């Protein structure tokens, strides 16, 4: 399979199955393949599309289990340990990502805007000349260049004849992630990842700062998949524990009356509604309350759910919580008005609030 | 509702000052009283006052 980020390209070729002598089918290493697969050209060695350079250097390669520990150990044993110099097996399964970023310094330059520092005068990098340039050099991509949700991996490879010092990658980016690189005689990849968001967030910023004489080619940005994210939302609007108790703050005690000793007995309640609590007196769902009967003192009565009747019984008043203080679990008593009585509020979540008290 | 409640009468605007969100409690006359008209755009008017 080709990425070429415009546009993919799959394609099928014959391999040859050693442990057969009877399939006299030719035999192709990997590079022979690709170059056949997509009508690719050798340039210098190096394989290019159009114009786009192919090998194992210039772009990111993918592969399965099988066709990875089938070169795994298909190297270590060949003279050249380039990879598109080993053979072509069946069941092979191959990706070929090219990046959407890259400069060698000697052919290519993806980059919108160019790094702080160049140095192309050389003769090293695998490839033409290499950056050399001891000092850093940073770069800055606007983010408008950059699909929003993705992140990408920035490849390229680093040596250091002298095998003493070392550089540090920064990536400002989701995270500002950190990074050392110990380079080598021979150059070496490395392949760092990130992640974009915000559709022109903050200009993502690569900088590489070494101390002492480095050497850098086929510097490579490449895609690699989506990562989800979240922005910002209208939540949960828990109240408080305040404004129940700012709602509750206006009631209404109705009473049925008893013609003998009149001590009118409580028939239930109300809580008023007024312009503010009509979204606090919403909250409450339950009303636990205890009271204190006739016959028998200061019990426990129920929890059950509120009734929601109009308010004083004036059908123009709108309807708010009514508190039926007859249907609550009682033996079947009346309860009494100026003597002790508490109405406690449960929120849906069970946390109970005190929200009067007959005293 | 219907106007003046006579029912040859049309329907017209009633603003039922009941129904509104008093504590509970009955409104005079002969003493202060203003009613806005308020455009569904948000933008209210005074249409009368009592004085
Ligand atoms: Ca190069």
């Known amino acids: 399979i080709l990425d070429t980020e415009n546009e993919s390209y799959e394609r099928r070729v014959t391999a040859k199955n050693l442990q057969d002598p009877e399939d006299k089918t030719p035999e192709l290493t990997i590079g022979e393949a690709i170059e056949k697969a997509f009508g690719a050209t050798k340039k210098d060695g190096l394989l290019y599309f159009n114009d786009i350079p192919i090998d194992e250097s210039c772009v ?20 050249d340990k380039k990879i598109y110099n080993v053979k072509l097996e069946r069941g092979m399964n191959i990706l070929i990502k090219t990046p959407t970023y890259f400069t060698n310094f000697d052919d290519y330059n993806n980059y919108p805007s160019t790094w702080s520092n160049v140095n192309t005068t050389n ?42 010092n070392s550089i540090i990658v920064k990536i400002k980016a989701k995270e500002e992630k950190t990074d050392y ?35 850098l080619d086929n510097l490579s940005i490449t895609e690699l998949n989506s990562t989800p994210e979240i922005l910002d939302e209208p939540e949960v609007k828990i109240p408080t524990d305040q404004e129940i108790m700012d709602a509750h ?20 309640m109300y809580f008023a509604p007024t312009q503010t609590n009509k979204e606090a007196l919403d909250y409450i769902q339950k009303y636990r309350v205890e009271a204190t009967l006739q016959y028998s003192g200061f019990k426990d009565i ?25 249907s609550y679990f009682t033996g079947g008593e009346n309860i009494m008005t100026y003597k002790k009585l508490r109405i406690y509020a449960i929120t849906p979540d069970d946390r109970e609030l005190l929200v009067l008290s007959v005293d």
């Not at 099988?66 to 060949?78: F, G, Q, R, V």
């Not at 950056?131 to 993705?150: D, Q, R």
């Not at 009473?255 to 409580?266: A, E, K, Q, R």
Request: charged share 25%; hydrophobic share 25%; glycine share 8%.
């Open 181 to 215: 690189l110990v380079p080598e005689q021979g150059y070496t990849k490395f392949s760092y990842e990130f992640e974009t968001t915000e559709k022109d967030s903050s200009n993502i910023e690569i900088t590489l700062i070494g101390s002492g004489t480095t050497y």
């Open 123 to 164: 003769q090293d990098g695998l490839q033409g000349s290499a950056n050399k340039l001891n000092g850093e050099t940073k770069i800055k991509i606007p983010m408008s260049e950059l699909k929003p949700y993705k992140r990408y991996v920035f490849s390229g490879y680093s040596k250091d004849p002298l095998t003493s």
């Open 302 to 326: 129920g929890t059950k759910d509120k009734e929601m009747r109009n308010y004083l019984g004036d059908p123009n008043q709108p309807k708010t919580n009514y508190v039926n203080l007859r």
């Open 60 to 79: 990111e390669l993918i592969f399965d289990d099988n066709t990875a520990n089938k070169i795994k150990d298909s190297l270590k044993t060949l003279s």
């Open 249 to 268: 703050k206006i009631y209404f005690a109705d009473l049925n009356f008893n013609p003998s000793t009149g001590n009118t007995y409580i028939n239930g």
